[PDB]
Amino acid sequence: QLQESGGGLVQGGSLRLSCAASGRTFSIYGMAWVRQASGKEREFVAAMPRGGGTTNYADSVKGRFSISRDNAKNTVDLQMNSLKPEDTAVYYCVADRGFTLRLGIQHDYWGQGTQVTVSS
Amino acid sequence: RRVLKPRHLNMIAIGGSIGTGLFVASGATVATAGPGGALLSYALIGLMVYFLMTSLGEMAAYMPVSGSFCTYGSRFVEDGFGFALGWNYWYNWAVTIAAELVAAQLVMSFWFPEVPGIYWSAIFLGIMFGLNVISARGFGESEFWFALIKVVTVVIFIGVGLATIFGIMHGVESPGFSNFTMGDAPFVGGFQAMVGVAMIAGFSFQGTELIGIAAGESENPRKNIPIAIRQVFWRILMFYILAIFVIGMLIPYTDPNLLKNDASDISVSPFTLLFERAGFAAAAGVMNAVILSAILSAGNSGMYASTRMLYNLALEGKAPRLFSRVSRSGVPRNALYATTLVGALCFLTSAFGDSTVYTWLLNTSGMCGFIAWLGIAISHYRFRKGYLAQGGRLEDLPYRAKLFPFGPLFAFALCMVITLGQNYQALVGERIDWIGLLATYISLPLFLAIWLGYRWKKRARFVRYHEMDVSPTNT
Ligand SMILES: N[C@@H](CCCC[NH3+])C(=O)O
């Protein structure tokens, strides 16, 4: 249903990660990206509708990440800048169905996810 | 037999007035001009349609004829004007049939997206041709039942939307006034988008002006006109406003599943989308099947009406005599063949896409309807001016208008500016060419050519004010 790509090892620069969806997806409202560390509570990161009229971030990561969409591959892209070792975690690309942009760390559809680690 | 209750007549009128504009074109209008612009455009179109229908009802009440507004246009302005109006009406019905076929092909998707829709359109056209050539006895009952089903599903949609907007059922949040204000203002685009969606808004309200003609059959129109006017006008306006408001508020304008020139994926009707995104599975399929059946019935009814009106036109000396020949059962054959040949235009989707062809057909139908509205408004204005010049008493008229000449003038100006501002940017730039002008404006050159040819071949001029038919005829 959902696929994520673009992960790897970053020394602390900038990196873009892409998420794509399978067929159907005509009963969905908007997607989101949520991180979690090794043996740590899930923490919301970003959220955005597919069409894209607004974006929602987290307080600790405001002004550093940029979530948008690309029509070349029709995929949701997230650009992370000024990456730091404290952000080493696994990201899940999720999405919600309804009439309103649902927030929180609870979602219906889940993907494989991508693990990102930062080395000194 | 006037055994039908007034409520039955009102619901029949409501079912007849409702077309494909609310089912499919509403999403495109919302995506293009936003909720507020669509609401304003629909309100203006409704007011214009109300004025035009009131004037037509007054015309029918004063002098009833069996030749509809074409006879009025012929006998009050010029014979060629009425001839061109009739041919434009026939072409409008043909374009409407083509648009119905295209819409059926388009809504046929979302169930089998891995097969071209050309085969489905061909099968539907063949089935319609077979039904038309076999018999047309069950037309009235089928039309009445389909109108009842359409009214029922419209009121069900209104009720479920009103239940959802406030929020009573569990498992779904209340969007509130969030989808309205998001990025761009509800009034998105500008003058260009407004006049662009004005064509669709006018197309949606077309077809409901003939009710006044029915009101011309009343023995005492004095009391029958206001009741029907009030009921039909209020019901249509309330239903349209509520449906468009619900669609605009519950669906964001930047939805990829809406009809546009560039579509990321397939597009579905807002009525189906509301149930599909509500988490209630196995319920959108029934509504989609109902929509498909309604589209098929509307297309069959339109084809039958176009064939019958073509035969009636061929009965007189206007059309060439090689159309009134009938078979042993009396069903015309040449008219049906011509209608099928003209409606075969819907096969260009395999070479030019789906959205563009549907938009072009909608634009052509709206332009033809606007030409007809301009003609009928001019005929009504000339008739009233001639009657005033004749000195006839105003109390003798069974019906009248409230504000004159505010009615005909305002509608004429609005229609003219809407028609003219569709593609004004072509002449502004250095590129002029002819592709855009031919693609956008095609009914006007044909109408002008037909009128000029008739005037040249008949040598006819305008009708004098003091030399016109004034005394009504009793049938
Ligand atoms: N409003 C009707 C008729 C449109 C064409 C009128 N000439 C419909 O959408 O079905």
Residue numbers in the entry:
A (entry chain B): 3 to 122
B (entry chain A): 13 to 487
Task: Show the paper's wording.
The structure of the LysP-Nb5755 complex was determined in complex with L-lysine at 3.68 Å resolution by cryo-EM. LysP adopted an inward-occluded state in the transport cycle with the nanobody binding to LysP on its periplasmic side. Unique to LysP, TM11 and TM12 are broken helices which have not been reported previously for transporters in the APC family. In the complex, the L-lysine ‘substrate’ is contacted by residues on TM1, TM3, TM6 and TM10. Specifically, L-lysine is coordinated by cation-π interactions with Trp105 and by hydrophobic interactions with Phe215. In addition, and unlike the other amino acid transporters, the ε-amino group of L-lysine forms hydrogen bonds with polar uncharged amino acids, that include Asn104 on TM3 and Ser377 on TM10. In this study, we observed that the α-carboxyl group of the L-lysine substrate forms hydrogen bonds with Glu112 on TM3 and with Gly33 on TM1, while the α-amino group is coordinated by Ser216 and Gln218 on TM6. We propose that LysP uses Trp105 as a gate that sterically clashes with the guanidinium group of arginine during the transport cycle in LysP, thus essentially shutting down transport of L-arginine. The LysP loops on the periplasmic surface of the transporter interact extensively with the Nb5755 nanobody used for structure determination, burying 793 Å2 and 882 Å2 of surface area on the nanobody and LysP, respectively.
LysP is an integral membrane lysine specific transporter that belongs to the amino acid, polyamine and organocation (APC) transporter superfamily. Under conditions of extreme acidity, the lysine-specific permease, LysP, not only mediates the import of L-lysine it also interacts with the transcriptional regulator, CadC, to activate expression of the cadAB operon. This operon encodes the lysine decarboxylase, CadA, which converts lysine to cadaverine while consuming a cytoplasmic proton, and the antiporter, CadB, which exports protonated cadaverine in exchange for extracellular lysine. No significant transport was observed with proteoliposomes reconstituted either without a proton gradient (pH 4 inside and pH 4 outside) or with the addition of a sodium gradient (50 mM NaCl outside and 0 mM inside). These results demonstrate that LysP uses a proton gradient for L-lysine transport.
